[PDB]
């Protein structure tokens, strides 16, 4: 055997918030200034270490634009954990989180693990969504919240680890 | 190749000069090995191929194009991340100018045609035209395209596009029934060709010279051609799709990770013959 558990992750979220960039930070440990508009769907692979046991995480990337929802909707059921990403510098992205959870309620598993990420925490001059205001929303819902920068190494690593633990504990 | 190419330029020029433009022979030249060769030939030919008049005056771009357009933010977003489609050589100042141009073409077409809906990926098409035809020509040609070949990709919903994508499988079944049965076992679906179909393989193929030569081929043929081209690729990749785990993740990622060295000219000829053999 190679891995002890395989968990299926899905990066849901608005468009241009940082999903693609995040996945590249965690799975490849790079960051590229433009990268590429994510069209359709695909995944990157990364196996980690947690509480003795070894975990193969396969993490799926999505297209943000609304029209693309009915295409990626199919890829929710098979997900152990779904990560809702918004950009802290963009007010609509945070305002849309509410709609994204509505998608998770609609398409994802009955008991799926959730996590809410505010990305681009490195842009302090342009920060719009409030640190304590996002935390409070998450807390009311019973979801882990983290603020992450994919540009700086910052906090990208811990986000996925926090998600992997939550799935594991639930899984048995 | 040289003398054979020299002939083609003379053939293509003879067809443009013909008493009425020999569009038939231009399509035929576009499908044949090498496409339309220089982008300069294309500036002449492509307009003939789309029936847009090359010598028309430019469309009027009104005062506050970006300001009032509902699609400014999204388009801007995609154009920013279009960087890799530009030649490595061209300097930032020039590239940014073209990018600023690219945003304006898209937003205008979207304005001139209210029924058309922007989608992520449209920008890969427009930028291809922008770098061949040029801003003035690209804007008129893509409009024609947007209302015919890409007409379904710009419907409010993804419905017609999904339907087009579904073709891929009945086509594979006609040529390699066993492969079709393997892929269905895996439940790969057809969303691996989304990028391919919607951007005319422009989002996915790295080498620009190969992208325009594909555009040559797509302009001359039927609107649904790109999917028959997708089918031909999967079929060409038979022994890797089968020699591979029969679960979605494995097959989806494999097809998704498209080879950079396809036998374009061989695949095109297969696409053609497959289109005529199993027509839509
Ligand atoms: N400063 C900063 N910019 C980011 C960060 N993540 C993404 N970006 C920007 O957003 C663009 C790409 O966003 P992307 O990840 O493709 O968005 P998504 O694919 O819709 O999630 C990049 O060109 C960067 O300019 C980040 O963590 N910090
Ligand atoms: F542009 Be992101 F991938 F929604
Ligand atoms: Mg993305």
Reading the helices and strands of chain A in chain order gives: EHEEHEHEHEH
- By CATH, the topology of the largest domain in chain B is Helicase, Ruva Protein, domain 3
Q: What is the CATH superfamily classification of chain A?
A: P-loop containing nucleotide triphosphate hydrolases
Separation of the first and last Cα atoms of chain A: 19 Å
| Total DSSP helices of chain B | 17
Briefly note the CATH topology name of chain A: Rossmann fold
What is the structural class of chain A? alpha/beta
Overall, the morphology of chain A is globular
Percent strand of chain B equals under 5%
CATH architecture label name of chain A:
3-Layer(aba) Sandwich
User: Regarding CATH, which class of the largest domain in chain B?
Assistant: Mainly Alpha
- The total beta strand count of chain A reads 6
InterPro entries (chain A): P-loop_NTPase, Rab, Small_GTP-bd, Small_GTPase
Organism (chain A): Homo sapiens (Human)
Keywords (chain A): Acetylation, Autophagy, Cytoplasm, Glycoprotein, GTP-binding, Hydrolase, Lipoprotein, Membrane, Methylation, Nucleotide-binding, Phosphoprotein, Prenylation, Protein transport, Transport
Pfam family, one (chain A): Ras
Describe the structure.
The complex is a heterodimer of chains A (172) and B (280). Chain A has 172 residues and is α/β, with parallel strands linked by helices. In chain A, 33% of the residues lie in helices and 27% in strands. Chain A has helices spanning 19-27, 69-72, 91-107, 131-141, 156-171, and strands at 5-13, 41-50, 53-62, 81-87, 113-119, 145-148. In chain A, strand 2 (41-50) and strand 3 (53-62) form a beta hairpin. Chain B is globular. By secondary structure, chain B is mainly α. Chain B contains 17 helices and no strands. Chain B has two domains: 1-146, Helicase, Ruva Protein, domain 3; 147-280, Cyclin A, domain 1. The complex binds guanosine-5'-diphosphate (GDP), beryllium trifluoride ion and magnesium ion. The site of beryllium trifluoride ion has 8 residues of chain A, from helix 1. It is classed as hydrolase activator/protein transport. Keywords: Rab1b, RabGAP, Fluorides, GTPase-Activating Proteins, rab GTP-Binding Proteins, HYDROLASE ACTIVATOR-PROTEIN TRANSPORT complex.
């Amino acid at each position: 055997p190679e891995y002890d558990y395989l968990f299926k992750l899905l990066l849901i979220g608005d468009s241009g918030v940082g999903k693609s960039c995040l996945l590249l930070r965690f799975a490849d440990d790079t960051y590229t200034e433009s990268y590429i508009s994510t069209i359709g769907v695909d995944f990157k692979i990364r196996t980690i270490e947690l509480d003795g046991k070894t975990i193969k995480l396969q993490i799926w990337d999505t297209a943000g634009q609304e029209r693309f929802r009915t295409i990626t909707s199919s890829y929710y059921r098979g997900a152990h954990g779904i990560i809702v990403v918004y950009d802290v510098t963009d007010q609509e992205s945070y305002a849309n989180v509410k709609q994204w959870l509505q998608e998770i309620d609609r398409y994802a598993s009955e008991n799926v693990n959730k996590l809410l990420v505010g990305n681009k925490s490195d842009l302090t001059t342009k920060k719009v969504v409030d640190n304590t205001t996002a935390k409070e929303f998450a807390d009311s819902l019973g979801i882990p919240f983290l603020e992450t920068s994919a540009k700086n190494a910052t906090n990208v690593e811990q986000a996925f680890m926090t998600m992997a633990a939550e799935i594991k504990k639930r899984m048995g | 190749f040289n003398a054979k190419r020299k002939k083609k330029v003379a053939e293509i020029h003879q067809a443009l000069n013909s008493d009425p433009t020999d569009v038939a022979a231009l399509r035929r030249m576009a499908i044949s090995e090498g496409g339309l060769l220089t982008d300069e030939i294309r500036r002449k030919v492509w307009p003939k191929l789309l029936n847009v008049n090359a010598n028309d005056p430019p469309p009027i771009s009104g005062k506050n194009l970006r300001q009032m357009s509902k699609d400014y933010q999204q388009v801007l977003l995609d154009v920013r991340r279009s960087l890799r489609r530009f030649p490595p050589g061209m300097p930032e100042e020039q590239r940014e100018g073209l990018q600023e141009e690219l945003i304006d073409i898209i937003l205008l077409i979207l304005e001139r045609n209210p029924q058309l809906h922007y989608y992520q990926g449209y920008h890969d098409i427009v930028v291809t035209f922008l770098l061949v035809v040029g801003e003035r020509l690209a804007t008129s040609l893509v409009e024609k395209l947007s209302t015919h070949h890409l007409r379904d990709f710009m419907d409010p919903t993804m419905d017609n596009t999904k339907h087009i994508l579904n073709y891929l499988m009945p086509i594979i079944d006609q040529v390699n029934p066993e492969l079709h049965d393997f892929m269905q076992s895996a439940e790969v679906g057809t969303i691996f060709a989304l990028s391919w179909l919607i951007t005319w393989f422009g989002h996915v193929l790295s080498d620009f010279r190969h992208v325009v030569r594909l555009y040559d081929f797509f302009l001359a043929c039927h609107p649904l051609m790109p999917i028959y081209f997708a089918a031909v690729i999967v079929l060409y990749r038979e022994q890797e799709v089968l020699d591979c785990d029969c679960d979605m993740a494995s097959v989806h990622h494999l097809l998704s990770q498209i080879p950079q060295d396809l036998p374009y000219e061989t695949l095109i000829s297969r696409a053609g013959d497959l289109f005529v053999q199993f027509p839509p």
